[PDB]
Amino acid sequence: NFIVLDKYIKAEPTGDSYQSESDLERELIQDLRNQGYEFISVKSQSAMLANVREQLQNLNGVVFNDSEWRRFTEQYLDNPSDGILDKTRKIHIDYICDFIFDDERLENIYLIDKKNLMRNKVQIIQQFENRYDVTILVNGLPLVQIELKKRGVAIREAFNQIHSENSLFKYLQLFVISNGTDTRYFANTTKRDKNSFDFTMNWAKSDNTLIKDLKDFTATCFQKHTLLNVLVNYSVFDSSQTLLVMRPYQIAATERILWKIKSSFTAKNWSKPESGGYIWHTTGSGKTLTSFKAARLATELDFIDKVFFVVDRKDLDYQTMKEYQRFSPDSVNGSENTAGLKRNLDKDDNKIIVTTIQKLNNLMKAESDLPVYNQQVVFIFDECHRSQFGEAQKNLKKKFKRYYQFGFTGTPIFPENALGSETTASVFGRELHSYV
């Protein structure tokens, strides 16, 4: 089911005292091969590229000769004129090459299969030819680089010590830094003070249970679906350009939201006060980012037709829209009126719509039985049922039925701070995932 775990797995030390740099390598290879991986031997650079033209065969089902592989190698996969940024863009944005065969038919060669990601074959290798390196290599390309240390190299100086040929090691998205007792991970940002252990991430369980050691970290995160979802569906290549990786509580809340959608659609549920739910992530979050990944994975999920991330305007429809235009390509304005918002409800393929609740009430109190009624519609609020039970919501319970009404709160109106509005007892029902 989920990605961020709910059950605390068994974590035991298997020493192998962690003042070494090879025993934890062997233990890590043992645990990954227990998790059904494949260890091959490439003490070279070209044979690694020979692995790609065989592992990609199973993923695409078509046969290269050597002559097509010349073109595919030098024009698309292994351009010498490219660094880390465009190659990361090739990982996350342009991951398909529209390749022309010598038989002259255009076929789409993938790199990472993103729809049905079980086909994406993983392998494990280690260092060859600096320090000691283990590499989880996905579909021929090296993606995750586990870098190991000792206790004398503390976690702050672990990053601070060290930050063609080879050019193939510019596909590395992550750098899982660990020593034997603490384990942190991050993406390609290499500053000294700011990109220290504060910007890196403690992987954790659902609520607050942080993970430090290796064996528990390997048992949790390095599953196939888990680590491939962390690589693919939960990382944003911002057009700064900067790769941004979600926090684990963000991923957990997004998974609870999307599984609530998935479990509610299969049991024909809509317009129920228990069909909703709400999240409390207060601040220091990038709630823009969590809401964006929730809405973006909702849009492709094919059960629905419209997603309304909708707030109350006090310079928010200019602000958060500017956030979602930062995550460059696509989000449709609810700007500027209730004439053209209907045009946005006519349009598709860019299904995330960011409007204000006031334009929605101006649409819903009039305009005579809109034709976007029967479609499956997901609301993502801000100032949710833990902040309001507003007149717009009872207008909504009057008009709409096939809606999944979710929301976010910054400070929830609990019974402990019930001075403003009610609690959540008949609007969103249960709380889903929180952070404090």
Binding site: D312, R313, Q358, K359, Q388, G420
Partner: protein
């Protein structure tokens, strides 16, 4: 159509926030009795609006009624593109000072047609011989009209701010 959502400074927590729509002109007392109060007079939380220009969340309603007169004074082709004129000017009052200087080319749509209008129709540079009439560069003359004066391009025509 040219309206606001103005309530309320009371209920900072905004528990069932109120106050829907008010066109122009605006009474203080009619809106105040529409939206209530917080036992004193602090109101006009300008949350949402729909206006051809931009206004802040702390603007007095008297300034809104002041600006609405100058906005509704102008013809519709100006009112359709008030932000485009604001990209060169700075205020609606400054637009009202120079509201007759703006020349509007409904016929012309791009700089080639603006140059062809100034040459063929007006004869701003002089008479046009017919054997010369096809052999006149319009693109370079259009670029120099762009770099000399100040032209703004919209959907309807071309706005020319003259001195």
């Amino acid at each position: 159509d040219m309206q606001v959502y103005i309530a309320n400074l009371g209920k900072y927590n905004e528990g069932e926030l109120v106050g829907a729509w008010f066109t122009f002109p605006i009474d203080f007392e009619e809106v105040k009795e529409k939206i209530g109060l917080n036992d004193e007079y602090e109101e006009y939380a300008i949350h949402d609006y729909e206006l051809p220009f931009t206004v802040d969340e702390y603007t007095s309603i008297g300034e809104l009624n002041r600006l609405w007169e100058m906005v509704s004074e102008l013809p519709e082709e100006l009112q359709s593109e008030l932000s485009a004129l604001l990209t060169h000017f700075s205020s609606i009052e400054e637009l009202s000072e120079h509201q007759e200087d703006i020349i509007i080319h409904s016929d012309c749509d791009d700089m080639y047609d603006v140059a062809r209008y100034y040459i063929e129709e007006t004869g701003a540079l002089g008479e046009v011989p017919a054997s010369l009439q096809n052999y006149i560069d319009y693109q370079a003359y259009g670029r120099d009209l762009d770099l000399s004066g100040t032209f703004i391009s919209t959907n309807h025509g071309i706005f020319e701010i003259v001195y």
